[PDB]
Design a protein around this ligand. Structure first.
Ligand SMILES: O=c1ccn([C@@H]2O[C@H](COP(=O)(O)OP(=O)(O)O[C@H]3O[C@H](CO)[C@@H](O)[C@H](O)[C@H]3O)[C@@H](O)[C@H]2O)c(=O)[nH]1
Length: 429
């Protein structure tokens, strides 16, 4: 009888984490309204089992639609990078529809993502409580806000220093770091992380923002066998811990030079590999001519989409060459796979540092101009996977996995307390 409306940001990684949060709330007697674009909602429904039909209802948010920008492109999954500004515009232009949904559904609480400032303001206008859920890590956020208060000192608890390539919209984001708060809705933030990895940063961020930081993560989905049948057949023929999974996400498409370096790095390592290579939604050559040679049956290149979670939980997988996106990093730590980091942009360089700090993987360093190196990638794959001579990395990965697996339902105890208090304060309002 208490209804929460969840509004994620467009984009599969954000969408999945909200769904895992939705499932937890549903099991706690909370009626959920899951709101997003139709393309995103369909992509995420298979992961929602039938048992939640009664308690989790899907709500469609309508973005402005045109014949060359139809609703299937109203997402960041496979979107051409040129079209992303249009997507940001279209999302903002949907605020008025959000009001109609919000007023008509009368949710007691709104949980929103960290990329739609119009969503809390719309909720405030209609006397609806709103709480921020941040699907990504705390390390990046704290590092960003540290210079504003202490431009003098270095980052207090980390020995990581950013590389020159990434040192180098942001305008609107440095206006979110001064966001005023004069109500309980903004007294707390939900974060997709856990203290064993970012406990010190969570304490620091709480001081920086003067707000409660409540961890509710990690939110990993433990897995139709759509593509797995062929992949599992191939994977079972390989020796244990002999194969690497290579993925760079759904919102970034590596360059021609970048993929050549990684392909050659894979070949030199002599490892087995499953590589998901993707092309934008709009539209052999991309990989080096003749690459798939020594890597005949020692490698697979999947087109479009692959079962990342299932592959990583196989016992033949001993490594994950990743772009160090937050959800992929959490999955690798949950499943006990050491990460071979190849960060590309956004928060990924910081997340790669966090993996290195935690001892659960190694980051392949970029050259002075910011260019991927074949030799660096090959060395780490050989050391981590082909010749298991970096055994400290491997042990910490399973130890981290063991820690993550052992967490029980107490993971959400703090969140339910904060929402309950907030939901009482608004009865008075
Ligand atoms: O072949 C694939 C590729 C991805 N996934 C899943 O899709 C998600 C991808 O995670 P991640 O790569 O972290 O998310 P993306 O949306 O692809 O990338 C973003 O991940 C961050 C957190 O969502 C964002 O803030 C950044 O803009 C961007 O790096 C995870 O659930 C993966 O398991 C699969 O199941 N199969």
């Amino acid at each position: 009888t208490t209804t929460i409306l969840m509004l994620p940001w467009l984009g599969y990684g954000h969408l999945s984490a909200f769904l895992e949060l939705a499932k937890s709330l549903s099991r706690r007697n909370f009626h959920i309204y899951f709101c997003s674009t139709s393309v995103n909602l369909d992509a995420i429904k298979p992961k929602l089992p039938s048992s939640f039909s009664d308690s989790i209802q899907f709500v469609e948010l309508h973005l402005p639609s045109s014949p060359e920008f139809p609703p299937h492109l109203h997402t960041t999954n496979g979107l051409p990078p040129t079209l992303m500004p249009a997507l940001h515009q279209a999302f903002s232009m949907a605020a008025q529809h959000f009001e109609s949904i919000l007023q008509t559904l009368a949710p007691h609480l709104l949980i929103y993502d960290s990329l739609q400032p119009w969503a809390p303001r719309v909720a405030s206008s209609l006397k609806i409580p709103a709480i921020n859920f941040n699907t990504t890590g705390v390390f990046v956020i704290s590092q960003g806000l540290h210079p504003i208060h202490y431009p003098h000192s270095k980052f207090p608890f980390s020995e990581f220093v950013l590389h020159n390539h990434w040192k180098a919209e942001r305008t609107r984001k440095r206006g979110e770091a001064f966001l005023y708060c004069l109500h309980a809705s903004c007294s707390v933030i939900l974060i997709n992380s856990f203290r064993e990895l970012e406990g010190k940063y969570m304490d620091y961020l709480s001081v920086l923002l003067n707000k409660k930081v409540v961890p509710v993560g990690p939110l990993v989905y433990e897995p139709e066998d759509e593509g797995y049948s062929s992949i599992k057949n191939w994977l079972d023929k390989k020796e244990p811990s002999s194969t690497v999974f290579v993925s760079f996400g759904s919102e970034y498409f590596p360059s021609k030079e970048e993929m050549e370096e990684i392909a050659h790095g894979l070949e030199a390592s002599e490892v087995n590999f499953i590589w998901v290579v993707r092309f934008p939604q709009g539209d052999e050559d991309a990989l080096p001519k003749g690459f798939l040679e020594r890597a005949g049956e020692r490698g697979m290149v999947v087109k479009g989409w692959a079962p990342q979670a299932k592959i990583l939980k196989h016992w033949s997988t001993g490594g994950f060459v990743s772009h160090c996106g937050w959800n992929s990093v959490m999955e690798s730590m949950m499943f006990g796979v050491p990460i071979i980091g190849v960060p590309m942009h956004v928060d990924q360089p910081f997340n790669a540092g966090l993996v290195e700090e935690a001892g659960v993987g190694v980051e392949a360093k970029r050259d002075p101009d910011g260019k991927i190196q074949r030799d660096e990638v090959a060395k780490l794959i050989k050391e981590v996977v082909v010749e298991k001579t970096r055994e400290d990395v491997r042990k910490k990965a399973r130890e981290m996995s063991e820690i993550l697996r052992s967490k029980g339902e107490e993971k959400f105890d703090e969140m339910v307390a904060e929402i309950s208090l907030l939901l009482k304060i608004e009865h008075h309002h």
